[model samples]
Target chain A: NIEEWEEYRYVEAGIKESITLIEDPGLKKMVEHVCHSGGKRIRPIILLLVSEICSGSYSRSLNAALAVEMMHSASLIHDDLLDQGLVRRNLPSAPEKFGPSGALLCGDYLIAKSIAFISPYGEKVIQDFGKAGMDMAEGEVLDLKENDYFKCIYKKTASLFAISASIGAYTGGAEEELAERFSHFGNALGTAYQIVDDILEFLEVVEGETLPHIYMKSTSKEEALKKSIDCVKLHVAAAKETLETFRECPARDKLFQITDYITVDMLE
Target chain B: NIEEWEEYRYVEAGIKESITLIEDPGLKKMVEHVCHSGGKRIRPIILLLVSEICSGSYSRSLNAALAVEMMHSASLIHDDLLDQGLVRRNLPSAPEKFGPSGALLCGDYLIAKSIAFISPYGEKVIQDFGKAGMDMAEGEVLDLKENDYFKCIYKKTASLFAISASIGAYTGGAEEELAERFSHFGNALGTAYQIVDDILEFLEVVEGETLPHIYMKSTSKEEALKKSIDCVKLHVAAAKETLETFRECPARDKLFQITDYITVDMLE
Candidate 1:
């Protein structure tokens, strides 16, 4: 537990350092304000543990991990703006404190900084992030359209999560096939993770409320709640099965514990 | 004239092709709609001309050239949203056509594609674009604050233009000092170019109106016209003189013609 939590602290600290590297004056303030909240840090944790399980140092994928956070944070800035959510984790969203225009410019800077952070890893790293970037945009459109539930989540959430693990595996010097495999594991994990949060919104269980219950039942009757939880377990099972393909080790075991903790065990 | 205009057409066609390379469906359509107007592409033209002057084939820097156009175009999408601009050149702005949310996503997608387009040229290319991207955002904030006119345009316009020339010089295999010289040339050119547009707006001689006359005097009085034109020529001289540093060649002469055409002569 100590080893794992320390890795999380390293990631949290590195992300803060990356923010200071931004050159703009007002933009630096906006980003600092937005990123102040301690997020779950789940993606970076998955990246670190995946990298270490393959015998790579936590240093190997540190920037890449920070990049995932930065990219995710950029989307949140715009997301809150468009969704018009006034608040999030301990403070108001950037769009609330800054005008929408200022918040957007801040988001744009974060995306640029994310590129600077990861471009040092070279082309494949950028392409992976690039593809996810496009996917995320398309997914945002789909969500706005409120087209299909699963398709929206797959593109918006799963694709980035897939890259999170895939990048970690590659930067950790894992085999190409192994990286691809970890990507699938991450894809399933992200799907379940988002659904779990969606359920939280449906149940009124946490954090400044969210608006989109379009993916869940209109009425959160007892049956609807149980049925949605059933859907969460389906993806959870897939994530667990994929993780089983790797050899057992402390890092791998910790990941399994994390998976359960994020998904099923939370129900208890 | 044929040779220079042919270069212009090559750049125009390449930009259209780059739009097709975007992987997302709805985003591609949104971008195509926004790009259809064919506004004066000052940045990409500078990139291509500078690359040619340094002996790089149109093919060598074509994608990078397209990237400059894409990045410029992406900024316009967001710009229109924030300014509430309804029209440009010949068509409705993307925010006028799509919702603001869709336009924003399209802008975000275009930025991602710009990175993918430039990343193949490696770290320096990405770094160049990254620096300009951050500068553009900062310039935007400064513009919104209605602070110093010079600082706003420098961050917003000049930085991107400077990189346009520098990336061309580098990808063209010019000497490092030579590329740095071209960067200075672009810096002056962009300053004068934006000022020229500001003058045009002040004169009420454009397809669509612009909101930010903050850089110029609130008065369109005769003195303001002559005084602003004087400011335009100051930067124009700096740009024209920088081109004198290079050997006389068709490409270099074309650049001087383009610079004159974009700036001083337009006053006629």
Candidate 2:
């Protein structure tokens, strides 16, 4: 099904393509180390799946997918550098290899490259993508200034997913009604993802992990998991409703099933 | 003259509004720090002058002005971080205060904000602005990667000036012919500014002065100056030709005077 492939092959391919597109020798090395290290391309997959379900052309979604991935990658690079933690994706982190300065410029380079690549998409896409990018920065800055996870993730993690999915729908030619539905779905889904991530971070800490931990690093694993599940349920509910607007396409069904899996039994 | 107060003030106000629109606190802080950090607003002034010279609406040039400034600010953040140096305009560098991670993210934040701010103008603006940003990044990266000051200055320093002027002309609703002329003018003037910077850096190094620290830390002073001067001469040749396209106006006169000042008296 589209959902299964979306998670496995499609996501993998997207990551590979992104790695290839990253030109800096240093950046490419870092991205390669991190992608293989861990984390999921859940955001890009969701974006592609959304496009497919809406009968949108893959080409149309390619720019958004790349842009979303670039944003994700840029954040990780900075997170590693700023947090002064090592061992991303089990490899020596970017800053460790390239040093803080190299990592910093490389991350900025990726962000700029992504924007330039997406510039040909048209005004709506440009504005949507641009606003989404700005939201990301705002979210990150909020966290830095406040050191609060809730608002930080809301702006950073959740906002980006919301942007990716909503823009995906727009690129797919989905009307305003469906676009709003998808935006809500994506935002909720992103919140759920952050909650789950928080859970993972805490689990590591509970297992006697060190500093530079994830969201769960701050909260109890059990509570984080509970919150994650609740957020996922909310997301899946909204996503399914949006999917209903589409005809019974295979892609639609796949998205629904994946949403169920991601929220309920997938991690388990 | 139309180019004097109204256009300059209008663009400056627009830049302030663009800063206000940024919702992220971290990003906002970074921008505010950089914007107020003793920059003479040289670029914004040039934009206003270009707009006035073209007899174009200052309102239309606002996006272009803000976009240019944001990119410039972003570069400054990255440059400071990369140099591992602190004290910008007599304040702690971004990385020095927020740490390297904050500095990198802040830079990305500004670039992303620039794109978002420029989105309203049209696809052409997006494409032009995006390319310019990429060019700037490429220029900087190329300099870092190859340590080629010549290529780096063109890509990093002069390109921004060229792009800013070109974009200013484009936004001013100049005819294609006039836009090209303006681009040439900006390109030349930008090279001139950088060349002067190069000479300043050279003198700083030879005299054991601190100001040249940025160049001396990363690159050879002689090489930076030589490349800077070459780029200025090349751009001046183009600017002289571009000046032929415009009728005599105060804006045009300032452009000419700036070029003349850079070409003759700058070295002395």
Candidate 3:
């Protein structure tokens, strides 16, 4: 656990270093606020772990990790704004804290800054990240029907995760096949993660409906929860299977642990 | 003039090509809507003309031109959303037509797509566009007060123009010094262009106070117009002078004509 936590420090520092490149005081303040806002840092952690597994060093992939995290932050800011959400990660939402104009510009700044950070890596990194950003935006628009729900999550959440893994593989100088396998692994893991999130929130349903609840309107709460848990198990299994091609290593074990983490509560 | 318009046809086609690469139908519709909703394609024209002047062909810079134009469209969408603008060009604003969420995502998509389009060229192009995008967002946040106005316009407007010119020069394989000089030329030209826009809107004064009027609170309407015209003239002069080092070419003449076009009404 100590070593696990240690890997994140580099990611934390890299995020700070990348963000401080913003020179304007007004934008810098807003960007810094958003960057420091709390989250699990799951995407970057996956990226760093995958890089270490493939390349034996995670240092080269640090900026890509930062880029994906910033992108995730940007999406949350805009998502909260669109949904009129009042809170994020137990704090006031960006629009509430900084006004709509400020929040909007802050999101825009993060997106642009993320691009700047990853551009030095070359066209593949830029293309993957850019495509994922566009897919996320499209996902938000299409996240209505139950049929669209899985597609939406894949686009909105899994796409970034896939890029993070793929970028890590690329940075590690993995062959194209291995890089793509990592992408598939990420996609499955992300889908499982989102489904589990849906199940947990469903268990705690208090007031308004979440996306999963809305999409699953045709089913009873119990049925929907059961179905979601089943889906998560399927994806978790798939995610683990994708790692079979990799040689045994500590980083590979961490990847297996992450899969277990996502499905452990459901199993109980 | 037909030949002038013909050059723009290339830009128009290139814009269509670049945007059509968006595979998601929902995102594509919004992106194409905002793109074709139309202002004059002045920025891309500048990029193409500069490329032609520096290299013998503008073909290589066409995608770069598309990238800049798309970037411009993205900025306008976000700017209108922030300003609560209801209309753009001659149509309902993106938010008005697509809903705020749709418009927001459309802007995000365009920004990402723009990056993808320019990325194949190399790191320099990507870096220039990334910096310009960040600058534009920062500009939006700091666009109040007289002192901040110049800085805002430079960031918001001039920075993109500077990138367009610099990218064109780079694409044309111009030396770094020439590319930088072109950047200076664009900065001045963009400043002049915005000032003239302020003057035109001031002359009409039909709706709300323009940014220039709001920022220059001390000046009379007549006095402010006079000062703005003077500022435009100064920038127009500076823009023209930056081209002094270029060898004679049709593109050079067009650049000169663009300068004259900016100050033509004042002469009248």
The candidate scoring highest on DockQ is 3
What is candidate 3's lDDT per residue for A114-179, written digit by digit as tens? 877787778777888888988888887776315577788888888988988898888888887888
Clashing pairs in 2: A37-A89, A138-B24, A198-A216, A202-A216, A202-A217
Candidate closest to the true structure, highest TM-score? 3
What C-alpha root-mean-square deviation, in Å, does candidate 2 show against the real structure?
5.7
Off by over 4 Å in 2: A1-40, A85-95, A144-148, A209-228, B1-4, B22-29, B51-55, B85-99, B145-147, B174-181, B209-234, B260-268
- Per-residue CA lDDT of model 2 for A146-193, tens digit only, reads 236667777777888787777778778888787777788777666666
- Return the TM-score for each candidate structure: 0.86, 0.81, 0.90
- Please, what are the lDDT tens digits per residue for candidate 3 over residues B1-268? 4235656889888877776677777777877787676566878888888888888788888878887887888888887776663223234433356656666778888887777777776877787888898889888877631657788889888899898889989888888888999999999998888877767777666555355586468867667667777788899889988887787988888778776775545446
Two-way TM-score contest, 1 vs 3, winner? 3
Model 1 lDDT per residue over A1-268, tens place: 4334867888878977876676667777888887777566778888888888777477868888888888898888878766763223134433356677876788887887777777776777788887787778778877776336777888888888898898888888887789999999999988888788777766675345122455344755565667668778888999999999987877788789888877777666
State the local distance difference test value for candidate 2.
0.67
DockQ of all predictions against the true structure, Cα-based: 0.42, 0.42, 0.52
Give the per-residue lDDT of model 2 (tens digit) for B178-259.
7666776777777667767666666765778222334556777666555556656766777778886776787777667667
